[PDB]
Design a protein around this ligand. Structure first.
Ligand SMILES: [Cl-]
Ligand SMILES: [Cl-]
Ligand SMILES: [K+]
Ligand SMILES: [Mg+2]
Ligand SMILES: [Mg+2]
Ligand SMILES: [Mg+2]
Ligand SMILES: [Mg+2]
Ligand SMILES: [Mg+2]
Ligand SMILES: [Mg+2]
Ligand SMILES: [Mg+2]
Ligand SMILES: [Mg+2]
Ligand SMILES: [Mg+2]
Ligand SMILES: [Mg+2]
Ligand code: NA
Ligand code: NA
Ligand code: NA
Ligand code: NA
Ligand code: NA
Ligand code: NA
Ligand code: NA
Ligand code: NA
Ligand code: NA
Ligand code: NA
Ligand code: NA
Ligand code: NA
Lengths: 81, 56, 194, 119, 46, 65
RNA sequence: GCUUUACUGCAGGCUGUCGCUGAG
RNA sequence: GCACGGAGGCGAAGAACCAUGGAUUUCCGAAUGAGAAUCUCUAACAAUUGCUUCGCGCAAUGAGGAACCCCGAGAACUGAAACAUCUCAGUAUCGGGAGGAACAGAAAACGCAAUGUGAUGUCGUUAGUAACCGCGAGUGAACGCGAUACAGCCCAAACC
């Protein structure tokens, strides 16, 4: 069985979203919906996912831009990995 | 109008595409039939004996 | 004493006489409104079926098949042909109608195999034959010492290879002597000359 | 139908089947067209039953004339399974033969009469 | 033109297959990409 | 390596599942560190983490969970 | 390739006959 | 792994490597819930069948494979120094189907005519013999014989 989350998509633009918008970007399996991406994320990092935007990339993978609630801090969640 | 060069310009149509069945770019997307494996016309795969010399 | 069957046979020797004559006139009317392939619970010619291998048992099916009469339905040539081959009207197929029937029937019952077939009359344009088919997968047939041979893999699609009754006869394999030089052991092996 | 030239009233039929059941217990009866046919031929048949719902009709066609030129009396039953059940079979039967009735040779003999009269 | 998720995947593979043999392979093999496809000079399938 | 077959079988169905979800996370964090061009790698393990996971799964099937 | 009262045949059309087809 | 780099790792808890057996085995694909250029939409043997507890409950078929095999359809160039029958040829090619081999097979046979042989293939021969044929060009067996291998049976019906 396939896993929802593949790995954190870390790039300059990903950083800006994390520092400035409290958003975490991930490389997720392309068969995963926004909702699945949401759950998986909350469960894996114990946070509150507010919104998820997806985009099927020219790399063959799906990218997910996940925004965490003001309650959580992306910068911190990402720093532990 | 020349049937040559000047008539080559209008060729922006898509027809034969990658066949889901045999992987060749011969799936005619208007016909929904593959010119190579026959997918969309035959359950059995396309094959003829003239594809090779009679005695081989 | 004469078997009850022997009567069924006697009657069919002259299908245009007496009672059976009026039976056909009756039936055919219903037959002509029936399909190409219709399964029937009981053989119209009991003696015949049983004689061929029929048994009122599980896994044995019988069906009546309608085939058009006449020569081959042939399309005229669309390119160069020498006179000899410009033929259309008088060309007839090398497979008799009964054998076509057997095949049509068999295709309608993909899992079953043809055991044998017989005629059941004909009007001005049809020809009806009844085909006996067998379910080589139903035990009772797998366990029948008189038919279990048809369950063998070597018999998959007997009709299509002419391993049938009419199949072998149509292939000119009746005689064991003179005349069968190009027939046995197979038309194809004899270069197709009979 | 083609081998049926006279119609047997519902009631007559009942007296017939009734006699058959006692026949199987008191006398002797033959079940099945083949066994029936041999009776008419071997003369051992007193009364023969023939269904009217037989298909194909060939299985029975011969009974009538066979019985007429053998003197053996015959009667028509409407239902095939009633003949069967009556003969004591769990299945149906196309034809039956009462080979020497039993505690019914009377009623029977008279049914044969009723039919002869039924033309 | 409007491409589908499947198409996009293929074009994607092709782009990847369009990278060069890594330097390290050269050394590991003591010593060419015969599948180099230019977007203008070459033509993909479908 | 650091995780042998005997040891996987000496676990209870609940211990393998616990060990499994454990390795998956090590792996997942391994990949994150790799995704961030992280050099504190030790390639021999990110590879092992995949094999350990296979074995555990293999055993889960053998034992019936 | 084409043509025709070139040679030989082949479709097609018309027509007689048989089978389907029975009562006075 | 090919693949001889860099870093790192595995192996005496006997790895690598080989054999057999087993696990896993995405999507399309006969492709079978429905649709679709390998993706998508809301429980599925789709379709045709057999049995049937008449419920997809139990089963079958589908498609592939180097050719070989069996059943159907069936040219023309060419040869005849033209060409029409004839020949190329039942070839090329096409439709349907089986197996590991197929097909054939235990005489309504043969017919060295016999006081004889004795299922069937195949091989050698019989023989370019007999037979065909604008009796042109061409076409072309069989019985038998010598070998190979051998194997002989089951229904329908009569009587139950
Ligand atoms: Cl068959
Ligand atoms: Cl001899
Ligand atoms: K010719
Ligand atoms: Mg979008
Ligand atoms: Mg032009
Ligand atoms: Mg690039
Ligand atoms: Mg599908
Ligand atoms: Mg010519
Ligand atoms: Mg010539
Ligand atoms: Mg052979
Ligand atoms: Mg000449
Ligand atoms: Mg010849
Ligand atoms: Mg001979
Ligand atoms: Na990636
Ligand atoms: Na079949
Ligand atoms: Na012939
Ligand atoms: Na291009
Ligand atoms: Na011309
Ligand atoms: Na595998
Ligand atoms: Na199935
Ligand atoms: Na069902
Ligand atoms: Na010449
Ligand atoms: Na010429
Ligand atoms: Na000739
Ligand atoms: Na001799």
């Amino acid at each position: 069985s396939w896993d929802v989350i593949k790995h954190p998509h870390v790039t300059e633009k990903a950083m800006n979203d994390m520092d400035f918008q409290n958003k975490l970007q991930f490389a997720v399996d392309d068969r995963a919906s926004k909702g699945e991406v949401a759950d998986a994320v909350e469960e894996q990092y114990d946070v509150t996912v507010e919104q998820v935007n997806t985009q099927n990339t020219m790399d063959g993978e799906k990218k997910a831009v996940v925004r965490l609630s003001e309650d959580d801090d992306a910068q911190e969640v990402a720093s532990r990995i | 109008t020349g049937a040559g060069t000047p008539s080559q310009g209008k060729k922006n149509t898509t027809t034969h595409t990658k066949c889901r069945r045999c992987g060749e770019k011969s799936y005619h997307t208007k016909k929904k039939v593959c010119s190579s494996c026959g997918f969309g016309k035959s359950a059995k795969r396309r094959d003829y004996e003239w594809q090779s010399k009679a005695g081989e | 004493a004469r078997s009850a069957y022997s009567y069924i046979r006697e009657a069919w020797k002259r299908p245009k006489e007496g009672q059976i004559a009026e039976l056909m006139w009756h039936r055919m009317q219903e037959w002509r409104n029936e399909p190409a392939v219709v399964r029937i619970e009981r053989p119209t010619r009991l003696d015949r079926a049983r004689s061929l291998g029929y048994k009122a048992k599980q896994g044995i099916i019988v069906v009546r098949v309608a085939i058009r009469k006449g020569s081959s339905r042939r399309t005229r040539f669309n390119k160069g042909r020498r006179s000899k081959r410009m033929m259309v009207n008088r060309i007839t197929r090398k497979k008799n109608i009964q054998r076509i029937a057997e095949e049509r029937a068999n295709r309608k019952f993909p899992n079953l195999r043809v055991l044998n077939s017989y005629s059941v009359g004909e009007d001005g344009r049809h020809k009806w034959h009844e085909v006996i088919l067998i379910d080589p997968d139903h035990p009772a047939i797998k366990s029948d010492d008189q038919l279990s041979w048809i369950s063998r893999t070597r018999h998959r699609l007997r009709t299509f290879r002419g391993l049938t009754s009419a199949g072998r006869r149509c292939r000119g394999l009746r005689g064991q002597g003179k005349g069968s030089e190009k027939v046995r052991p197979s038309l194809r092996v004899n270069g197709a000359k009979a | 139908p083609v081998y049926v030239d006279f119609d047997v009233p519902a009631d007559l039929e009942d007296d017939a089947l009734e006699a058959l059941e006692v026949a199987r217990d008191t006398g002797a009866v033959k079940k099945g067209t083949n066994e029936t046919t041999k009776s008419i031929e071997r003369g051992s048949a007193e009364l023969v039953f023939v269904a009217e719902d037989v298909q194909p009709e060939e299985i029975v066609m011969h009974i009538p004339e066979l019985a007429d030129e053998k003197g053996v009396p015959f009667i028509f039953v409407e239902q095939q399974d009633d003949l069967g059940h009556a003969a004591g079979l769990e299945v149906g039967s196309a034809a039956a033969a009462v080979t020497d009735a039993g505690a019914a040779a009377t009623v029977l003999e008279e049914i044969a009469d009723k039919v002869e009269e039924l033309r | 033109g409007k491409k589908s998720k499947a198409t996009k995947k293929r074009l994607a593979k092709l782009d990847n297959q369009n990278s060069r043999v890594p330097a390290w392979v050269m050394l590991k093999t003591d010593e060419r990409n015969h599948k180099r496809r230019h977007w203008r000079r070459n033509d993909t399938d479908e | 390596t650091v995780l042998h077959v005997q040891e996987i079988r000496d676990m209870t169905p609940a211990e393998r599942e616990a060990e499994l979800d454990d390795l998956k996370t090590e792996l997942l964090n391994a990949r994150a560190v790799q995704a961030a061009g992280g050099a504190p790698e030790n390639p021999g393990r990110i590879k092992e983490l995949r094999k350990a996971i296979a074995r555990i799964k293999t055993i889960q099937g053998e034992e019936g969970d």
